Design a protein around this ligand. Structure first.
Ligand SMILES: NC[C@H]1O[C@H](O[C@H]2[C@H](O[C@@H]3O[C@H](CO)[C@@H](O)[C@H](N)[C@H]3O)[C@@H](O)[C@H](N)C[C@@H]2N)[C@H](N)[C@@H](O)[C@@H]1O
Ligand SMILES: NC[C@H]1O[C@H](O[C@H]2[C@H](O[C@@H]3O[C@H](CO)[C@@H](O)[C@H](N)[C@H]3O)[C@@H](O)[C@H](N)C[C@@H]2N)[C@H](N)[C@@H](O)[C@@H]1O
Ligand SMILES: NC[C@H]1O[C@H](O[C@H]2[C@H](O[C@@H]3O[C@H](CO)[C@@H](O)[C@H](N)[C@H]3O)[C@@H](O)[C@H](N)C[C@@H]2N)[C@H](N)[C@@H](O)[C@@H]1O
Ligand SMILES: [Mg+2]
Ligand SMILES: [Mg+2]
Ligand SMILES: [Mg+2]
Ligand SMILES: [Mg+2]
Ligand SMILES: [Mg+2]
Ligand SMILES: [Mg+2]
Ligand SMILES: [Mg+2]
Ligand SMILES: [Mg+2]
Ligand SMILES: [Mg+2]
Ligand SMILES: [Mg+2]
Ligand SMILES: [Mg+2]
Ligand SMILES: [Mg+2]
Ligand SMILES: [Mg+2]
Ligand SMILES: [Mg+2]
Ligand SMILES: [Mg+2]
Ligand SMILES: [Mg+2]
Ligand SMILES: [Mg+2]
Ligand SMILES: [Mg+2]
Ligand SMILES: [Mg+2]
Ligand SMILES: [Mg+2]
Ligand SMILES: [Mg+2]
Ligand SMILES: [Mg+2]
Ligand SMILES: [Mg+2]
Ligand SMILES: [Mg+2]
Ligand SMILES: [Mg+2]
Ligand SMILES: [Mg+2]
Ligand SMILES: [Mg+2]
Ligand SMILES: [Mg+2]
Ligand SMILES: [Mg+2]
Ligand SMILES: [Mg+2]
Ligand SMILES: [Mg+2]
Ligand SMILES: [Mg+2]
Ligand SMILES: [Mg+2]
Ligand SMILES: [Mg+2]
Ligand SMILES: [Mg+2]
Ligand SMILES: [Mg+2]
Ligand SMILES: [Mg+2]
Ligand SMILES: [Mg+2]
Ligand SMILES: [Mg+2]
Ligand SMILES: [Mg+2]
Ligand SMILES: [Mg+2]
Ligand SMILES: [Mg+2]
Ligand SMILES: [Mg+2]
Ligand SMILES: [Mg+2]
Ligand SMILES: [Mg+2]
Ligand SMILES: [Mg+2]
Ligand SMILES: [Mg+2]
Ligand SMILES: [Mg+2]
Ligand SMILES: [Mg+2]
Ligand SMILES: [Mg+2]
Ligand SMILES: [Mg+2]
Ligand SMILES: [Mg+2]
Ligand SMILES: [Mg+2]
Ligand SMILES: [Mg+2]
Ligand SMILES: [Mg+2]
Ligand SMILES: [Mg+2]
Ligand SMILES: [Mg+2]
Ligand SMILES: [Mg+2]
Ligand SMILES: [Mg+2]
Ligand SMILES: [Mg+2]
Ligand SMILES: [Mg+2]
Ligand SMILES: [Mg+2]
Ligand SMILES: [Mg+2]
Ligand SMILES: [Mg+2]
Ligand SMILES: [Mg+2]
Ligand SMILES: [Mg+2]
Ligand SMILES: [Mg+2]
Ligand SMILES: [Mg+2]
Ligand SMILES: [Mg+2]
Ligand SMILES: [Mg+2]
Ligand SMILES: [Mg+2]
Ligand SMILES: [Mg+2]
Ligand SMILES: [Mg+2]
Ligand SMILES: [Mg+2]
Ligand SMILES: [Mg+2]
Ligand SMILES: [Mg+2]
Ligand SMILES: [Mg+2]
Ligand SMILES: [Mg+2]
Ligand SMILES: [Mg+2]
Ligand SMILES: [Mg+2]
Ligand SMILES: [Mg+2]
Ligand SMILES: [Mg+2]
Ligand SMILES: [Mg+2]
Ligand SMILES: [Mg+2]
Ligand SMILES: [Mg+2]
Ligand SMILES: [Mg+2]
Ligand SMILES: [Mg+2]
Ligand SMILES: [Mg+2]
Ligand SMILES: [Mg+2]
Ligand SMILES: [Mg+2]
Ligand SMILES: [Mg+2]
Ligand SMILES: [Mg+2]
Ligand SMILES: [Mg+2]
Ligand SMILES: [Mg+2]
Ligand SMILES: [Mg+2]
Ligand SMILES: [Mg+2]
Ligand SMILES: [Mg+2]
Ligand SMILES: [Mg+2]
Ligand SMILES: [Mg+2]
Ligand SMILES: [Mg+2]
Ligand SMILES: [Mg+2]
Ligand SMILES: [Mg+2]
Ligand SMILES: [Mg+2]
Ligand SMILES: [Mg+2]
Ligand SMILES: [Mg+2]
Ligand SMILES: [Mg+2]
Ligand SMILES: [Mg+2]
Ligand SMILES: [Mg+2]
Ligand SMILES: [Mg+2]
Ligand SMILES: [Mg+2]
Ligand SMILES: [Mg+2]
Ligand SMILES: [Mg+2]
Ligand SMILES: [Mg+2]
Ligand SMILES: [Mg+2]
Ligand SMILES: [Mg+2]
Ligand SMILES: [Mg+2]
Ligand SMILES: [Mg+2]
Ligand SMILES: [Mg+2]
Ligand SMILES: [Mg+2]
Ligand SMILES: [Mg+2]
Ligand SMILES: [Mg+2]
Ligand SMILES: [Mg+2]
Ligand SMILES: [Mg+2]
Ligand SMILES: [Mg+2]
Ligand SMILES: [Mg+2]
Ligand SMILES: [Mg+2]
Ligand SMILES: [Mg+2]
Ligand SMILES: [Mg+2]
Ligand SMILES: [Mg+2]
Ligand SMILES: [Mg+2]
Ligand SMILES: [Mg+2]
Ligand SMILES: [Mg+2]
Ligand SMILES: [Mg+2]
Ligand SMILES: [Mg+2]
Ligand SMILES: [Mg+2]
Ligand SMILES: [Mg+2]
Ligand SMILES: [Mg+2]
Ligand SMILES: [Mg+2]
Ligand SMILES: [Mg+2]
Ligand SMILES: [Mg+2]
Ligand SMILES: [Mg+2]
Ligand SMILES: [Mg+2]
Ligand SMILES: [Mg+2]
Ligand SMILES: [Mg+2]
Ligand SMILES: [Mg+2]
Ligand SMILES: [Mg+2]
Ligand SMILES: [Mg+2]
Ligand SMILES: [Mg+2]
Ligand SMILES: [Mg+2]
Ligand SMILES: [Mg+2]
Ligand SMILES: [Mg+2]
Ligand SMILES: [Mg+2]
Ligand SMILES: [Mg+2]
Ligand SMILES: [Mg+2]
Ligand SMILES: [Mg+2]
Ligand SMILES: [Mg+2]
Ligand SMILES: [Mg+2]
Ligand SMILES: [Mg+2]
Ligand SMILES: [Mg+2]
Ligand SMILES: [Mg+2]
Ligand SMILES: [Mg+2]
Ligand SMILES: [Mg+2]
Ligand SMILES: [Mg+2]
Ligand SMILES: [Mg+2]
Ligand SMILES: [Mg+2]
Ligand SMILES: [Mg+2]
Ligand SMILES: [Mg+2]
Ligand SMILES: [Mg+2]
Ligand SMILES: [Mg+2]
Ligand SMILES: [Mg+2]
Ligand SMILES: [Mg+2]
Ligand SMILES: [Mg+2]
Ligand SMILES: [Mg+2]
Ligand SMILES: [Mg+2]
Ligand SMILES: [Mg+2]
Ligand SMILES: [Mg+2]
Ligand SMILES: [Mg+2]
Ligand SMILES: [Mg+2]
Ligand SMILES: [Mg+2]
Ligand SMILES: [Mg+2]
Ligand SMILES: [Mg+2]
Ligand SMILES: [Mg+2]
Ligand SMILES: [Mg+2]
Ligand SMILES: [Mg+2]
Ligand SMILES: [Mg+2]
Ligand SMILES: [Mg+2]
Ligand SMILES: [Mg+2]
Ligand SMILES: [Mg+2]
Ligand SMILES: [Mg+2]
Ligand SMILES: [Mg+2]
Ligand SMILES: [Mg+2]
Ligand SMILES: [Mg+2]
Ligand SMILES: [Mg+2]
Ligand SMILES: [Mg+2]
Ligand SMILES: [Mg+2]
Lengths: 47, 273
RNA sequence: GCCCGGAUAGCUCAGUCGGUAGAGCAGGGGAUUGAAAAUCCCCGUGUCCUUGGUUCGAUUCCGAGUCCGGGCACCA
RNA sequence: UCGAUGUCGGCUCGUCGCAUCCUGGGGCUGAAGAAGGUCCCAAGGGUUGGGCUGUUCGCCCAUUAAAGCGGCACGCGAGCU
RNA sequence: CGAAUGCCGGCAUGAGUAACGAUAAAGAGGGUGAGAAUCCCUCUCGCCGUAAGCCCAAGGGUUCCUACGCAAUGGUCGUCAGCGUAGGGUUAGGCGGGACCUAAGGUGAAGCCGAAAGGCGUAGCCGAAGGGCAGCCGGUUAAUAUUCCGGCCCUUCCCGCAGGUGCGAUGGGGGGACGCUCUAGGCUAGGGGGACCGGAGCCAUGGACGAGCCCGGCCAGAAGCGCAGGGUGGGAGGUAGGCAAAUCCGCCUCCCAACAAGCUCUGCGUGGUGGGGAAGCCCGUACGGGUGACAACCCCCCGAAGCCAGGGAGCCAAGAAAAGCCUCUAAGCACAACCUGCGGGAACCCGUACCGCAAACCGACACAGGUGGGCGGGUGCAAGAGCACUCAGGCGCGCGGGAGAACCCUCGCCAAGGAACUCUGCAAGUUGGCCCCGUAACUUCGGGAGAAGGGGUGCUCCCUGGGGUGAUGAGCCCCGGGGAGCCGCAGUGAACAGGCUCUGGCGACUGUUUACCAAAAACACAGCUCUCUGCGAACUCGUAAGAGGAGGUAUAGGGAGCGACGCUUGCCCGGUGCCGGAAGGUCAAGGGGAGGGGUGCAAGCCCCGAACCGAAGCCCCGGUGAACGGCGGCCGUAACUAUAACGGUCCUAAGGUAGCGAAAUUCCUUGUCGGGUAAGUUCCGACCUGCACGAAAAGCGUAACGACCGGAGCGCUGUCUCGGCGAGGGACCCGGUGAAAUUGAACUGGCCGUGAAGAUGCGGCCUACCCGUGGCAGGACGAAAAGACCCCGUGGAGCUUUACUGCAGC
RNA sequence: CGAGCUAGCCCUGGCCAGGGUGAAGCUGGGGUGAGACCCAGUGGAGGCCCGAACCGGUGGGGGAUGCAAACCCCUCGGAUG
RNA sequence: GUGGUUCGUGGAGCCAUGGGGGAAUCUGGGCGGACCACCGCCUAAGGCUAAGUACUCCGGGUGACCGAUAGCGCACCAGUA
RNA sequence: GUGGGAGAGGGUGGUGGAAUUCCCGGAGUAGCGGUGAAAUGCGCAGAUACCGGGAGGAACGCCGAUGGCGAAGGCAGCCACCUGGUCCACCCGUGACGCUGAGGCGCGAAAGCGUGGGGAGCAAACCGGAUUAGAUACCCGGGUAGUCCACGCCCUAAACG
């Protein structure tokens, strides 16, 4: 039956992408946190 | 005048459609249409601000002329009578003699082939717009400006009309379709006649779907909801209002007057609805 | 089974600061009528449900009891 | 027994008690006979099919030798409903 | 540390147990190899075939091809692999996207708003499965191909030559440019048939050397031409409108053509050329290659939902934009520029492997689930994408071998009976397609209707009516009509394919809903009523700006109730709400200051403060019921009796009107009576004593409708009396792989007792060799889940209100 | 941080085999003073009918450490809105 | 009208200020806890100003600090799988 | 046929004044209304009575008659349009073309009904005040359908001469 994850690449990038994060003071602080933790990816992969 | 249907289905027996006999032209004046964005009753936040709206047939907007006075004295011929989906009324196509085309909302009895014109001039006759002060007392009239230069506001709806009860000072006394008695300014244009398509109030939608076509989605009673939702929500099986009947936002809905008391336009009103 | 009300003239009901209790209708005697209603003039009258008790004195306050009006009997 | 002892009835499957419904054996009889009444012995076996209702129960139809009453966590849901 | 349903890890029990993932299905020969049911090859068998085949798009990301491998992954095996290692593989001016356009939305010079962060917003800009734009056929690789090659065609940019012309834009105008249903004519895709053309070969087993059987009989193609079709008037004059200008467009007038006539555009056909090309046999190919062959390459018929395409008709709910394109003029330039033809040159970036209804995507799995678009052959069955079989193609579902117990599942059949089963005909059966005959109550006249109930249905011959295409004819194809016979148990012979009636409740209806225990009588619904709202509307969201409402205007919009239709919808305004009320009472800040007080020598500075003036609110006056709501009781009375039309009285704001009534409502209750049944707590009809109906939380009806819920009957049945037999997949045995919850430890009997009151574990008796396997569920107060009922906690949370207190709002 | 599930709306596309019923209109005929209206033929309407795809999820059975954390089978509702 | 302070409206001054009214330049102004007198203190409505102070990504020294279930989540290619 | 007449004969569209009611302005004060008599009701929140302005509906005084017209039901301010019936005169035309009339068709007061409008006055129902033994009546105060318009129904009557 139809499940919760229905991949689409435009969505993924349009939504969790770098430019998106940067757009919003909330998301700029996501990058800040992930960078401080030293995440390898700051941002989901997509493609 | 209101086509009926034999009951060859249920709901085809109560359905009633407008009679389109008056309609001359079957596709609009391309220079005169523009697209109109459908809201869904949603504001510039994506938020519904008017409930139960949406779906329903796509429409092109007819840009219509509610200022008649920037054409003063230039006559025009009534080219066709057309169906405007954006209103109860019907719209008359005007060919002006200097070759501009306009839509006017179409008065009762106005027929194709007619000369029509606006100004302090001009005969008192159906289709002709004038500042109110020159329209003789007693004349029924429509498409009335509320303040000068600001466009037709009052009596635009199919069958509606206003009537001139008297002059006082700079202002004239109109009775509105509502029956309110209103001072309006003398220089406000009004075009003479009623709106016509008066038959309009008797159409009988006839089924649920036909309401949907006009873009009105179903409407659920407060009675049918739960207390989270509405003053009338809840309460084991059915039940009465159990309080003064309210809106979902909890203000009272039988009789409570919502006109702001201290409005300035108060000085200009004489009566009720 | 548990809580509430009520009992006052023949009927329907009022009232009581614990001291001499009333309204209507009925009823009795007279008038009026040919006669009968309607009308008029006189007329009363109950031991205030029972039984204890308080008090100088209880329809009135107390505690029990009848019998009628009523409400309840929910979670299982 | 609340860090769970599933709770009415039906069904299936039994098993026991006797304060015996029938069949067996008796006494008394207001027991002529036949048919009963009542009490005594007796638990081996038996103890129907339907209409109504979730019903247990109970009432009704049609039969019967009779259509017995109780217990078994109101017997039985790791057996079904 | 021994306990915390503790934490982390290790290893046990259950147990060689359940299971090994669709019941489409296998068998043998050969091969390879240490090893083979499981890999390759052949033959045979089976399954899919509107797919289980083929091609796009997403998403996945080397899974692709090849060699070498088998430790682990693979539910077994494994020499195989979507696995390990390694090497190779994706080629474009024309396909997709970008260097083009705009949609919703986004963003956003201007601008507005907001403590900050930020919110809005015109122009513009971004944004696509929409608009715009130039490639078709075939060949080639182990692996890419509209990409490489071959053939035949084309686009844009730059430069030039020729001819043409007032050239010229982000400005103007035209166009692009649109719905839904139905549909004409001509075509193509696709298909069937041919005695015609071409082809290896075949004659079995009784027959056939045959006008036999088997196979194939095309594809693409510029210009021209031809057939069908879309678009489309020409000229003059006037001109104040299209935010400058316009010779364009609009508007008025006059003159010509009404028509594809012309012009133009597109489909199809034909076309220089190019290509393809079966069966069968051989070659060994893993997989293809040789030949068939100088292959033929034509006639007929059916024929789209596709094309001509902006076709036509009807209807109401009235059906994007912008660029490309054409036209017009403006600066400016006219040696420019542009237009047409020709010719050379120039033509970038990204994608292209493979999977793709799935073992490669979403579902932790090589998961019986989910996933958009196109193609989807044949024959038969009325049709069809249905059904059965089948082609191309693809599969036999990654554990097998056996046995032929119980029991389970899925399936077949059954004497007599036929609902007796049961909460209930739950389940199963019956019915079943098409043609003809026939069809009631009632009804809103449409329906009810497939009412119900019947007859027909195959094949053979003979005769015969109408149509399409052809020619008006043959042939092909479509629809029938009449007659005479033949066969079986049976002719919609297999598959797909309503059981029917009567009568109540509720809801008018089609719809909608608790994803995952409720599909309903609930929601919605057209429709009816009340109410607000005069437009910068009321209302809603937002601190605001803004926005929705609505580019709408009272025939409109919001809110509430009721809920098609029919006939109707009574009385009460005391209380509450809303509405009206320029009086009166009360009323806060403020005004006002009679009077009083602090201090100083004083002038003074400072504080308190009566009258009186003073909003909305409340009080007060009234109105209002499709506003919140409410709509009694007692006693007497008629010439049998009984009852009580009548009278009396208490109380109230007034005491339930019509209709209906033991009801989706009736406690007593299985009310009483009638109906139905042999028998009826249900059901239908009455009655009225309505615990505790009653008129828009609508009253009473209503045709039609319903996977709603009652009650009856016919039909038919394994529901049942009451079971039996049979089939397959399990269960059982053998070989391979091998879990699970649970588990203080266990050397774990019965009775009668006792015990914290239900004992394998204590007492006394009884019974009892050790250990398994297939079975059944009575017990281990079996497992599971720290009871969801109940209480408790000065625990929580949702909801309400004339609870308290605030806040938004007004 | 989430509307890649789910709910509503906005923009832009696509899809719905085959059969059946036969509204208006139209045209003819009849009728009339004219009409209403009646009959035929044509026409092809509809939250119309049967039934695939597609969307559902009605009843029963199975499953219940599943094939599956909602599935399978039989049956059933809608199918131009 | 509020905030700050120990000050929660208190006898409530002080410092700050959203609203209203609204001065003077030394004989001017603020303050010493309502107010007044006296006596003092101080000079608002512009600005800058090291050090002594806080911290530890980083480097170094030292531990009656851990010793791979400890010590940082990470002694190991960990903010990784 | 010609030439004339009379009339509230019908359909349509316009249009006038009186009055009632409401609203606004003015002025003015204690009662108005009502009846058998009263009360309810209205009125110091300024009623009644008076003047001026406005709004809206319905009906048309005098003329007016015991009169006229219509087949009946019916028809009454004024104006115009459209249109029926009818009488007279002249003796011109047709040449028995006539009378009636089952069925049919059409009209048909009031009330009532549907959908819209409209609503001043009146007014079933209803409320209230009186009267009465009662009073679901007569009288008074309110008052909703209705009365009016359009369109479609109903088809009745002491539709009577
Ligand atoms: N109703 C449940 C059970 O009843 C009977 O047995 C019970 C029995 O009932 C009686 O049985 C008799 C024998 O048939 C009858 O004749 C009696 N009328 C009856 O009361 C009881 O005396 C027992 N204590 C219990 C037993 N289960 C049945 N035999 C069973 O099949 C049935 O399942
Ligand atoms: N018991 C004898 C009769 O009594 C009543 O009638 C009286 C009536 O009762 C009234 O009933 C009303 C309802 O019906 C109530 O609402 C009145 N409040 C009440 O007073 C009295 O108001 C009359 N004065 C006398 C009348 N005979 C009954 N109506 C009758 O059925 C009964 O038969
Ligand atoms: N059939 C034709 C005509 O017959 C009559 O006219 C007559 C007309 O009547 C006049 O009609 C008028 C309309 O009603 C009245 O206003 C006059 N008062 C009256 O005298 C006579 O004056 C003529 N002499 C003869 C005419 N036949 C009808 N009345 C008219 O309607 C009709 O048009
Ligand atoms: Mg997941
Ligand atoms: Mg995408
Ligand atoms: Mg920043
Ligand atoms: Mg890295
Ligand atoms: Mg926006
Ligand atoms: Mg937003
Ligand atoms: Mg209508
Ligand atoms: Mg609505
Ligand atoms: Mg609703
Ligand atoms: Mg609810
Ligand atoms: Mg909410
Ligand atoms: Mg609420
Ligand atoms: Mg409520
Ligand atoms: Mg209720
Ligand atoms: Mg409710
Ligand atoms: Mg409000
Ligand atoms: Mg009393
Ligand atoms: Mg005494
Ligand atoms: Mg005498
Ligand atoms: Mg005493
Ligand atoms: Mg005493
Ligand atoms: Mg409970
Ligand atoms: Mg409770
Ligand atoms: Mg317990
Ligand atoms: Mg347990
Ligand atoms: Mg005995
Ligand atoms: Mg015996
Ligand atoms: Mg004897
Ligand atoms: Mg004897
Ligand atoms: Mg025995
Ligand atoms: Mg039963
Ligand atoms: Mg019991
Ligand atoms: Mg019983
Ligand atoms: Mg018990
Ligand atoms: Mg039990
Ligand atoms: Mg049990
Ligand atoms: Mg169970
Ligand atoms: Mg049970
Ligand atoms: Mg157990
Ligand atoms: Mg311990
Ligand atoms: Mg431990
Ligand atoms: Mg083990
Ligand atoms: Mg075991
Ligand atoms: Mg086993
Ligand atoms: Mg097994
Ligand atoms: Mg398998
Ligand atoms: Mg198998
Ligand atoms: Mg070998
Ligand atoms: Mg070998
Ligand atoms: Mg083999
Ligand atoms: Mg097959
Ligand atoms: Mg096929
Ligand atoms: Mg993946
Ligand atoms: Mg790999
Ligand atoms: Mg391996
Ligand atoms: Mg293996
Ligand atoms: Mg596996
Ligand atoms: Mg590999
Ligand atoms: Mg190329
Ligand atoms: Mg491109
Ligand atoms: Mg470039
Ligand atoms: Mg763009
Ligand atoms: Mg923004
Ligand atoms: Mg900003
Ligand atoms: Mg695109
Ligand atoms: Mg392209
Ligand atoms: Mg080409
Ligand atoms: Mg390939
Ligand atoms: Mg030019
Ligand atoms: Mg064919
Ligand atoms: Mg062919
Ligand atoms: Mg040949
Ligand atoms: Mg032979
Ligand atoms: Mg031969
Ligand atoms: Mg063969
Ligand atoms: Mg011009
Ligand atoms: Mg210009
Ligand atoms: Mg077109
Ligand atoms: Mg067209
Ligand atoms: Mg110039
Ligand atoms: Mg490729
Ligand atoms: Mg593929
Ligand atoms: Mg699938
Ligand atoms: Mg597909
Ligand atoms: Mg695959
Ligand atoms: Mg598999
Ligand atoms: Mg799968
Ligand atoms: Mg998977
Ligand atoms: Mg699908
Ligand atoms: Mg068929
Ligand atoms: Mg097809
Ligand atoms: Mg099929
Ligand atoms: Mg057989
Ligand atoms: Mg049988
Ligand atoms: Mg039978
Ligand atoms: Mg039943
Ligand atoms: Mg069934
Ligand atoms: Mg019948
Ligand atoms: Mg019919
Ligand atoms: Mg039939
Ligand atoms: Mg029927
Ligand atoms: Mg029927
Ligand atoms: Mg037959
Ligand atoms: Mg045959
Ligand atoms: Mg069949
Ligand atoms: Mg089928
Ligand atoms: Mg069948
Ligand atoms: Mg059928
Ligand atoms: Mg019932
Ligand atoms: Mg329904
Ligand atoms: Mg559910
Ligand atoms: Mg749920
Ligand atoms: Mg349903
Ligand atoms: Mg619902
Ligand atoms: Mg209704
Ligand atoms: Mg605003
Ligand atoms: Mg706005
Ligand atoms: Mg707006
Ligand atoms: Mg708008
Ligand atoms: Mg509304
Ligand atoms: Mg409702
Ligand atoms: Mg009511
Ligand atoms: Mg009230
Ligand atoms: Mg009130
Ligand atoms: Mg009141
Ligand atoms: Mg006052
Ligand atoms: Mg006040
Ligand atoms: Mg009051
Ligand atoms: Mg008597
Ligand atoms: Mg009642
Ligand atoms: Mg009853
Ligand atoms: Mg009954
Ligand atoms: Mg009841
Ligand atoms: Mg009962
Ligand atoms: Mg039954
Ligand atoms: Mg029942
Ligand atoms: Mg009944
Ligand atoms: Mg009710
Ligand atoms: Mg109500
Ligand atoms: Mg209802
Ligand atoms: Mg009913
Ligand atoms: Mg009816
Ligand atoms: Mg019904
Ligand atoms: Mg339905
Ligand atoms: Mg249903
Ligand atoms: Mg029942
Ligand atoms: Mg039955
Ligand atoms: Mg069986
Ligand atoms: Mg078997
Ligand atoms: Mg024991
Ligand atoms: Mg021991
Ligand atoms: Mg011991
Ligand atoms: Mg065992
Ligand atoms: Mg057991
Ligand atoms: Mg607990
Ligand atoms: Mg407490
Ligand atoms: Mg608490
Ligand atoms: Mg609580
Ligand atoms: Mg969504
Ligand atoms: Mg149709
Ligand atoms: Mg139909
Ligand atoms: Mg349908
Ligand atoms: Mg398809
Ligand atoms: Mg199901
Ligand atoms: Mg369900
Ligand atoms: Mg199930
Ligand atoms: Mg089970
Ligand atoms: Mg269907
Ligand atoms: Mg403070
Ligand atoms: Mg305090
Ligand atoms: Mg302070
Ligand atoms: Mg101070
Ligand atoms: Mg300040
Ligand atoms: Mg000073
Ligand atoms: Mg200071
Ligand atoms: Mg100081
Ligand atoms: Mg001091
Ligand atoms: Mg100081
Ligand atoms: Mg410092
Ligand atoms: Mg370690
Ligand atoms: Mg560690
Ligand atoms: Mg170690
Ligand atoms: Mg370790
Ligand atoms: Mg660690
Ligand atoms: Mg006249
Ligand atoms: Mg007169
Ligand atoms: Mg003569
Ligand atoms: Mg003659
Ligand atoms: Mg009439
Ligand atoms: Mg009338
Ligand atoms: Mg009156
Ligand atoms: Mg009265
Ligand atoms: Mg009288
Ligand atoms: Mg009225
Ligand atoms: Mg008369």
């Amino acid at each position: 039956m139809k499940r919760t994850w229905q991949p689409n690449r435009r969505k993924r990038a349009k939504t969790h992408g770098f430019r998106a994060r940067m757009r919003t003071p909330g998301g700029r602080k996501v990058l800040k946190r992930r960078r401080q933790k030293g995440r390898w990816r700051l941002t989901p992969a997509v493609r | 005048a209101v086509k009926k249907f034999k009951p060859y289905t249920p709901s085809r027996r109560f359905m009633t459609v407008a009679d389109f006999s008056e309609i001359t032209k079957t596709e609009p004046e391309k220079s005169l249409v523009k697209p109109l964005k459908k809201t869904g009753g949603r504001n510039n936040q994506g938020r519904i601000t008017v409930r139960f709206r949406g779906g329903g047939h796509k429409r092109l907007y007819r840009i219509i002329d509610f200022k008649r006075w920037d054409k003063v004295g230039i006559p025009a011929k009534v080219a066709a009578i057309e169906y405007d989906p954006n209103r109860s009324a019907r719209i008359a196509l005007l060919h002006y003699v200097d070759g501009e085309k306009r839509y006017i909302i179409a008065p009762d009895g106005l027929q194709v082939g007619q000369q029509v014109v606006a100004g302090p001039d001009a005969p008192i006759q159906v289709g002709n717009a004038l500042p109110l002060r020159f329209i003789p007392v007693g004349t029924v009239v429509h498409a009335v400006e509320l303040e000068p230069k600001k466009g037709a506001k009052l009596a635009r709806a199919a069958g509606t009309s206003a009537q001139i009860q008297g002059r006082e000072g700079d202002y004239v006394i109109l009775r509105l379709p509502s029956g309110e008695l209103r001072k309006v300014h003398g220089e406000c244009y009004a075009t003479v006649g009623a709106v016509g398509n008066a038959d309009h109030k008797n159409i009988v939608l006839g089924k649920a779907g036909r309401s949907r076509w006009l873009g009105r989605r179903p409407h659920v009673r407060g009675a049918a909801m739960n207390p989270v939702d509405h003053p009338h929500g809840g309460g084991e099986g059915r039940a009465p209002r159990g309080r003064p009947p309210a809106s979902p936002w909890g203000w009272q809905t039988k009789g409570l007057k919502t006109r702001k008391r201290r409005k300035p336009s108060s000085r200009f009103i004489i009566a009720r609805r």
